[PDB]
Amino acid sequence: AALVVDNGSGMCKAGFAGDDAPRAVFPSIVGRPRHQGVMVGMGQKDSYVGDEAQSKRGILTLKYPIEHGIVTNWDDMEKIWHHTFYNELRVAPEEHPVLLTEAPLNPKANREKMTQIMFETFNTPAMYVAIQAVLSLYASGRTTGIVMDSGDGVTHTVPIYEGYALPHAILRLDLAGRDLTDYLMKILTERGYSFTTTAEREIVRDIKEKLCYVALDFEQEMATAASSSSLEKSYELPDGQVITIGNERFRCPEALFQPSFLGMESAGIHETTFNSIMKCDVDIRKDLYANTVLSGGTTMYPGIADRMQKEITALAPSTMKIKIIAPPERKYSVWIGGSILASLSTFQQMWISKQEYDESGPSIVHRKC
Amino acid sequence: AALVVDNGSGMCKAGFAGDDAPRAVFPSIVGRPRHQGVMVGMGQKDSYVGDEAQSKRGILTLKYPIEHGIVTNWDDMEKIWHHTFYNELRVAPEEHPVLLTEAPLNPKANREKMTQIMFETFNTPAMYVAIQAVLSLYASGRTTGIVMDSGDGVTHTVPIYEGYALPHAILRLDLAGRDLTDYLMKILTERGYSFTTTAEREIVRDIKEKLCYVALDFEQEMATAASSSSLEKSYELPDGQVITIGNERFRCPEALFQPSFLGMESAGIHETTFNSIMKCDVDIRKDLYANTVLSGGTTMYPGIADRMQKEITALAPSTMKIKIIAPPERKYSVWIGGSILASLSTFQQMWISKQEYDESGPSIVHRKCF
Amino acid sequence: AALVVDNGSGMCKAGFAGDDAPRAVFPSIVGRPRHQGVMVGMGQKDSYVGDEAQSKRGILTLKYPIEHGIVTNWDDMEKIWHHTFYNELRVAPEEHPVLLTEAPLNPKANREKMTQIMFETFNTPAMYVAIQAVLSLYASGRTTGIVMDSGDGVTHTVPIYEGYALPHAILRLDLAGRDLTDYLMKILTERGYSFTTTAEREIVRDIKEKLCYVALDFEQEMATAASSSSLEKSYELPDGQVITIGNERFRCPEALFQPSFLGMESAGIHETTFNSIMKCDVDIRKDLYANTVLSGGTTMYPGIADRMQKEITALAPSTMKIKIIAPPERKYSVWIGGSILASLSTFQQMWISKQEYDESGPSIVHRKCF
Amino acid sequence: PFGLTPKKVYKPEVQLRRPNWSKFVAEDLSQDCFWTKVKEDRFENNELFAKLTLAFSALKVLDSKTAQNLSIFLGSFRMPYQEIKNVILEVNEAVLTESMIQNLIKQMPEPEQLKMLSELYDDLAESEQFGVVMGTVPRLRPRLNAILFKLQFSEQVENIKPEIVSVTAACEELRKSENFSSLLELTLLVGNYMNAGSRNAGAFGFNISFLCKLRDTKSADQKMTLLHFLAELCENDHPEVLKFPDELAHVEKASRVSAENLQKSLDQMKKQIADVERDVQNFPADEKDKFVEKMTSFVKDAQEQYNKLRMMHSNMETLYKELGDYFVFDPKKLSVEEFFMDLHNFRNMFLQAVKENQKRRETEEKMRRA
Amino acid sequence: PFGLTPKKVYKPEVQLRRPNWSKFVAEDLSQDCFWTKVKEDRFENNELFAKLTLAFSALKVLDSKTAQNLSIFLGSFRMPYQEIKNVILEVNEAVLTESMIQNLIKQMPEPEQLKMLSELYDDLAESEQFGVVMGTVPRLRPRLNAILFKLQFSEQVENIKPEIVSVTAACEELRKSENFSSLLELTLLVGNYMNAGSRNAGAFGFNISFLCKLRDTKSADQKMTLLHFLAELCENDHPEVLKFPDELAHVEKASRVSAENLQKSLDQMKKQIADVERDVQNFPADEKDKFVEKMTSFVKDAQEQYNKLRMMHSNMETLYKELGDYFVFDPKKLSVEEFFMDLHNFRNMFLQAVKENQKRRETEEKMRRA
Ligand SMILES: Nc1ncnc2c1ncn2[C@@H]1O[C@H](COP(=O)(O)OP(=O)(O)O)[C@@H](O)[C@H]1O
Ligand SMILES: Nc1ncnc2c1ncn2[C@@H]1O[C@H](COP(=O)(O)OP(=O)(O)O)[C@@H](O)[C@H]1O
Numbered sequence A: 001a002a003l004v005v006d007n008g009s010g011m012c013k014a015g016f017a018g019d020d021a022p023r024a025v026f027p028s029i030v031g032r033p034r035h036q037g038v039m040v041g042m043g044q045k046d047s048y049v050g051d052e053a054q055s056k057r058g059i060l061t062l063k064y065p066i067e068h069g070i071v072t073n074w075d076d077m078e079k080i081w082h083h084t085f086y087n088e089l090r091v092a093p094e095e096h097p098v099l100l101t102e103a104p105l106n107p108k109a110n111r112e113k114m115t116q117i118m119f120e121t122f123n124t125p126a127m128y129v130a131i132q133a134v135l136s137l138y139a140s141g142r143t144t145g146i147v148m149d150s151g152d153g154v155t156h157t158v159p160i161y162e163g164y165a166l167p168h169a170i171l172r173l174d175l176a177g178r179d180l181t182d183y184l185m186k187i188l189t190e191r192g193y194s195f196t197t198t199a200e201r202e203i204v205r206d207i208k209e210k211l212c213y214v215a216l217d218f219e220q221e222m223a224t225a226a227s228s229s230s231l232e233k234s235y236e237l238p239d240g241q242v243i244t245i246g247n248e249r250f251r252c253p254e255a256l257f258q259p260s261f262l263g264m265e266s267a268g269i270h271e272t273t274f275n276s277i278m279k280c281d282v283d284i285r286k287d288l289y290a291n292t293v294l295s296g297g298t299t300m301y302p303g304i305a306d307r308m309q310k311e312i313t314a315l316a317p318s319t320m321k322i323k324i325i326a327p328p329e330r331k332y333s334v335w336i337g338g339s340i341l342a343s344l345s346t347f348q349q350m351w352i353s354k355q356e357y358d359e360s361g362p363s364i365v366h367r368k369c
Numbered sequence B, C: 001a002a003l004v005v006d007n008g009s010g011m012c013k014a015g016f017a018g019d020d021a022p023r024a025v026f027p028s029i030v031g032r033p034r035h036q037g038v039m040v041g042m043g044q045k046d047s048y049v050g051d052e053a054q055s056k057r058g059i060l061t062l063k064y065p066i067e068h069g070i071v072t073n074w075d076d077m078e079k080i081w082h083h084t085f086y087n088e089l090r091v092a093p094e095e096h097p098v099l100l101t102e103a104p105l106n107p108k109a110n111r112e113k114m115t116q117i118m119f120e121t122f123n124t125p126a127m128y129v130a131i132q133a134v135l136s137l138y139a140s141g142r143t144t145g146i147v148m149d150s151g152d153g154v155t156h157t158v159p160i161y162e163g164y165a166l167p168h169a170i171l172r173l174d175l176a177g178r179d180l181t182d183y184l185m186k187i188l189t190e191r192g193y194s195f196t197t198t199a200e201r202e203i204v205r206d207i208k209e210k211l212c213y214v215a216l217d218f219e220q221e222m223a224t225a226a227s228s229s230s231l232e233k234s235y236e237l238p239d240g241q242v243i244t245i246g247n248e249r250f251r252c253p254e255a256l257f258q259p260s261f262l263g264m265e266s267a268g269i270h271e272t273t274f275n276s277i278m279k280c281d282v283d284i285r286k287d288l289y290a291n292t293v294l295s296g297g298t299t300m301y302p303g304i305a306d307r308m309q310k311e312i313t314a315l316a317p318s319t320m321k322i323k324i325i326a327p328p329e330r331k332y333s334v335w336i337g338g339s340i341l342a343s344l345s346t347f348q349q350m351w352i353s354k355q356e357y358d359e360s361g362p363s364i365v366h367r368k369c370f
Numbered sequence D, E: 001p002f003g004l005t006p007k008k009v010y011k012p013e014v015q016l017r018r019p020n021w022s023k024f025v026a027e028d029l030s031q032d033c034f035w036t037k038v039k040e041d042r043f044e045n046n047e048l049f050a051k052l053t054l055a056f057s058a059l060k061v062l063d064s065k066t067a068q069n070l071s072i073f074l075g076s077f078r079m080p081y082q083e084i085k086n087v088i089l090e091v092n093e094a095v096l097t098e099s100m101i102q103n104l105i106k107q108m109p110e111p112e113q114l115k116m117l118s119e120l121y122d123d124l125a126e127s128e129q130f131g132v133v134m135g136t137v138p139r140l141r142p143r144l145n146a147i148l149f150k151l152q153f154s155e156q157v158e159n160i161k162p163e164i165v166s167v168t169a170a171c172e173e174l175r176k177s178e179n180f181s182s183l184l185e186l187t188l189l190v191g192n193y194m195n196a197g198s199r200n201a202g203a204f205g206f207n208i209s210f211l212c213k214l215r216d217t218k219s220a221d222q223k224m225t226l227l228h229f230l231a232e233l234c235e236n237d238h239p240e241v242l243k244f245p246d247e248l249a250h251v252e253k254a255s256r257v258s259a260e261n262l263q264k265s266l267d268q269m270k271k272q273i274a275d276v277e278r279d280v281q282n283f284p285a286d287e288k289d290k291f292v293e294k295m296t297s298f299v300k301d302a303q304e305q306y307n308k309l310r311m312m313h314s315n316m317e318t319l320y321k322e323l324g325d326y327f328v329f330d331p332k333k334l335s336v337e338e339f340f341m342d343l344h345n346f347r348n349m350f351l352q353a354v355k356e357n358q359k360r361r362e363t364e365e366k367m368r369r370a
């Protein structure tokens, strides 16, 4: 029974093979105590990783070991992988092969480091690495379609034609969810609410994850909010106070489609899907326009599928139909797509054995995967 | 002659346009007598505001109308303006446009209420709310440079490149002089003194204003100060007693560079400015690394410019040169810039006239102002 | 005092007839600010054209008015010509005839539009348009040969004969400097350096223009790069950061000879020169094969003459002789040829004078200048 | 000859593959050449001949691509294929979906591959076992194709409907537009005035799309434009012409779609129903398969719905050809997309042109008041 | 026509901008269309035209081919031709370049053309005036043809000499190659075993190029090959024969050229040197022409250097004919290219054959360990 460990920028997923609805799901967070522990009786640990660090976030610091896909700190991630394998899954990695996922267009050093860690620190019998968006396609059942994935810091649009991707037209944008959360707390200050600490960062993420929607027409929706308070909602803080958000509900989700608010020259996430299409063949675009499957947690705003279809239509010629798919479990599309890979008996021959790694080192991954 | 007013979290500076003198300057505090009245021959005033409140500080519970730059009480703030326009400047706001200043990232309510209160109560022919940090750059005469404006309550940096600001890279920190004065009381308890009253807060402010400095290097000072009594600059209390402050003369401004002393998770004022520039574009960083300007009262400690310059260079690129500009008059930098702004000929068309406010309402301040 | 202007996707070369070097060589970019001009007084002139846009590129939207040779915006193109005539050259076109250059296989609509702009907006007394590739041989002395013209957006191999380009043998390849610069960003990410905005495009262009060469072979060069670090080079960004490219030095211009790396089915610039020759006559093939002349700034990679000659050898017949010619003036080749053409005493005959333009309208440019 | 012919008899037990070489008789080379003293004994032995004569002694059903893709697809929905076969047999609208059926037929191999599997169970893989169950259903290729009309026929007819009604409404709206006629007259008269004494003097009409070219005409001063001239003239003394853009409300959708695209779509769906008609005759009809009237009766309403589309599509040809004769242009050199997009863009130009006239007047009023 | 052509004579006093629209002659629309009854009167007046005009108030002897080409070439270098005439006369290696004169001799017209020019100054064109200057020099046509000797004679020897010395070096290396003899013996004895009882039974030798045909021979299993069997056999019990590819190092250089090409090149050089001897006798030898000994004494070293090209190339014939008898093949049915490129292909294919043997062995070792 192989394993799948889809590490994410802001939250990680884990579970066995031949499964859906990932089992061991906890945020990729590492926090260490900030103050001095007066109590002696308590068994305070050096660091809290995962779900434990979220409950006690009042005194912790909540450092992210992964940012924009590229791993900044590798010392703490070994805690995360050890945490995933031993406590959450309770499985010895020395007997069961492990699968990994990784974003496209990333430095070769990052994926080489994972190869080193699993084979000596964990001593996995075999390991494989696959692109995230390729897993996202045949999690929807198809094999020919552009995958537009948006996580915390990575927004990559990978056109796909078959079991093989198209590296020529792979695009990327640093406009994903984590950047929007920092924007939400920036626009919460005009209302008199200030959020600065990393503990108060997680609070703002829950405001976005519950009271934020994508407006079909931003220009029209602005007049409705200003004319009357027909869109205001109230949210309760853990301490007990309640705050009200007006036009901040749709302003921060829409920065994807107008990144000029964030001060970035990059074109909108709607346009980066259209531009990524024109980099492929003219014959190919027929199948690539009707299968624009959306994946990733950031693509779960209410009305995002409707908004994308309207804006893509204006850019594209009328001769081509547009169909923005949206599977019900689009949040965990990456995990389930890789889950069926290990189920196949044919995939056994596509492993990176320890003997192969020993004779080639970490460089074996580049020629194989 | 336009009227320039700079209301701050701890002290207000209001004068005329063109003249380089801030004219009347007095603290922005209001106090109400908490003691019962006995003598009736002499006339007794209501709650005291302005500089008169500091004279009788021993009986009044002084209250600050402005907290962290955000106006917490709008009742006492109108009292100061009447104390300003009539008692001090002896001018009628009935014919003088009045400039206002407001920190960036401030709630929209404060800039609205400033427009509403002044238009209906003072009926000034015009008005304007202008950012303090951007206003201070006029005093220096430059046109680019990330400006640190550390007032009594607010600490914000605005990167300006060739006259075009970068609002996406504006960083504001809620750590300033007022927070330090509370830290000074917390460290004085260790030696064995007490300061737990709002009348004793002004006195502790004079401990920090006159006998505080920022060390060039900090980890060595504790070794030096503990070993020998090199620095023991003593201070006399208003009653007549005398106090001695040792290594705490420099620990108080140290929190600006290590806010972990106050328990806050925010970075110091040396890291924030570096982080603010990193949010900008690659090309414009060259003209911002070597053009760091300073202003405000909190940037008047000894060694603040030298300490920041050493700390920035520990993070800046090696080939990059760091030049922490600090004019001698950085205390009034905001106001001097305001006087130049009002007297500009091209500025006459930017005023928010009386007729425009009525037909647009209090939201006009979000259209004709930055 | 004839003027010669060579419009290009990347840069535009302007000057006077009879000179040896262009008077002004500035990028053909039009930029407008995207931020808000908080600074009063200055910050005007939102239309920055030419070198001014390059200097302030950190706060501008760098948009190229020319893409793939064809003009995608005819509003800022008039600005560039206005800037060239009045700022860089400082001359009134009211008395100076002007010569222009056109790309091979240009649409008939674009060429006729340029006639109207010269004759109405600037009302030059005369104007002529000449093929870009033909002017390369006029500058290279010889009147017969094949021009491997290149540049920022277009790559044309035009085997002219007696100064008249053969129309059926012209081959166009969509592989020029801009695609090479864009490919550099995609491959640079493999090391850990990312460049997205148009402001950082010029940084990648400068890296390409300095630290990239063409390798003769790859079956041994790739092993050499991986085995040893002898070929690494270091570049300093305007931020002051240090980046080492190394392996990606020769992989950026090799897309010219192996476009399959970019995913394009078309063959490289070495193979398009071969096919363009075969379309010509058999008897004239002898002269054009040994008279290949390079042009355009895209052909300034060191090691391009020996690489192309070696690759062109195997496909060429054994008895045939090959001589790739690389004049020192590759960058300005298409300009000096226009200077030679205009300086002729016989060039007065086929002037498109203003008197004869009105009678035949803008359609005269189709039958006069050919 | 020269004592160099010791013919070695071999007589192999098993015949081998004889290699054919050019014969070298021992008459020419036997005089004095190489191979006269071959050390045959130094290689001759028993082991070599015995070994040499031995060597020269004279997902399974699916291919690589389909085996993995079918295995991936069969696990994509993780549901039994036995119910899937019954679902497609009964045409169950809940389980069946357009996306599910579209990428299903991609996973069918050639029809031959599904035949011998039935004649040939648990040993075979899930991909091979799926084909056995699916292949048992007769006429797999047409029946699965037979499903995929009603899943999309409703979608196609509802998409052509807003494409046709918008163009026809745009044609009718432009037919009755008096303001369009009023605007057109003004251009012709003023244009004829300036074109006097030229090749276009007193022109009795101009082709369409020239109005969008009026902006390209400038004046003595570059700010003043001919397109803006008409808007400025109209607003002064000839009103009610500015209302023509409001008269046309479906031109944008009319410009978006073209009749050429519609004709291809209509021709395709005609072939779709024809396949069902051949299916009905080839496969006479029930209880086992719930297809019953889901297709034969669907065609009845499809042909009824189709006939209305043919009339509506033919309504363009009657209307557009008259429209083509109205403006004098055959619907062969000009189509719906190019003509209306040109007019769609013209509407944008005029509203912008009258907008800039107001802006210039605003500055004109500003300087007059000052 | 249809009573709809009342042409309006305008005759503007001041010429205006004339917009160019597509002409509509009153034939195609005159019959029955729109604009037949344009109300031109409701717009015509005298104010509008007065306002409208305010804003918009505005070679003698040379043929065609050579005359322009010569004029272009003269301006290409842009330097006085009198000096250039001295350069070619004085043979100045600095100004004179190969490229300058190869197209120069093309620019020379027929020798008769330059004659009357001398007999017939400023009135004539730049090409005609230059025609007189070149025509003055006696025997122009042979003189420049005499100049194109040292620019190639020194180039020809260094281009051919590595080719000349590489062929012999391979021949001597192949002459002493014992490993080649050992390999050849193995094929002959083994091959005769398979050919027993056939038309090639007991063959005492075979023609060259058969070794590369060993790959085409297969075995009972398609994986095994006859040539690969020899590679596998030698590595088992007959080593030291794998070093024959290393024994030959100049395989690629010698096989790329043929003696036939060198014979033609040498023959042409003899003809080139013959023209000088005729020129010297015809033109006796000064101060005016510094070519003096630069060409006749060049022959003195040329003949010495050309002599060394004879015997060594003669050593080719002596060695190759001996090599031809060594392998039993006349140097008439087989040349350097055909004989050696076949052997060079054998060297590459043998290394590949032993490479696949190692690859095949690796899979065998992998399964044995598993
Ligand atoms: N309902 C929701 N609405 C908006 N954003 C959401 C929602 N749910 C999750 N997100 C965003 O998804 C991000 C993380 O989800 P996920 O896709 O699992 O991360 P990753 O793609 O990095 O693995 C969070 O930053 C959060 O902002
Ligand atoms: N000479 C000084 N030395 C040290 N600190 C000073 C000095 N002058 C002013 N300050 C500090 O500046 C703070 C506020 O002063 P100021 O900048 O004038 O207020 P604001 O910026 O709100 O107008 C006070 O808290 C005080 O601690």
Ligand SMILES: Nc1ncnc2c1ncn2[C@@H]1O[C@H](COP(=O)(O)OP(=O)(O)O)[C@@H](O)[C@H]1O
Pocket: C007, C008, C009, C010, C011, C012, C150, C151, C152, C153, C177, C178, C181, C205, C208, C209, C210, C295, C296, C297, C298, C299, C300, C301, C331, C334
């Ligand atoms: N030394 C160099 N090495 C490699 N590329 C260069 C060099 N110099 C210029 N380039 C590229 O060539 C382009 C200039 O092309 P140019 O000949 O000006 O085209 P055009 O003639 O169309 O203006 C630049 O965009 C640059 O990217």
Ligand SMILES: [Mg+2]
Pocket: A006, A007, A008, A009, A132, A151, A334
């Ligand atoms: Mg993910």
Ligand SMILES: [Mg+2]
Pocket: B006, B007, B008, B009, B151, B152, B296, B334
């Ligand atoms: Mg202040």
Ligand SMILES: [Mg+2]
Pocket: C008, C132, C150, C151, C296, C334
């Ligand atoms: Mg060019």
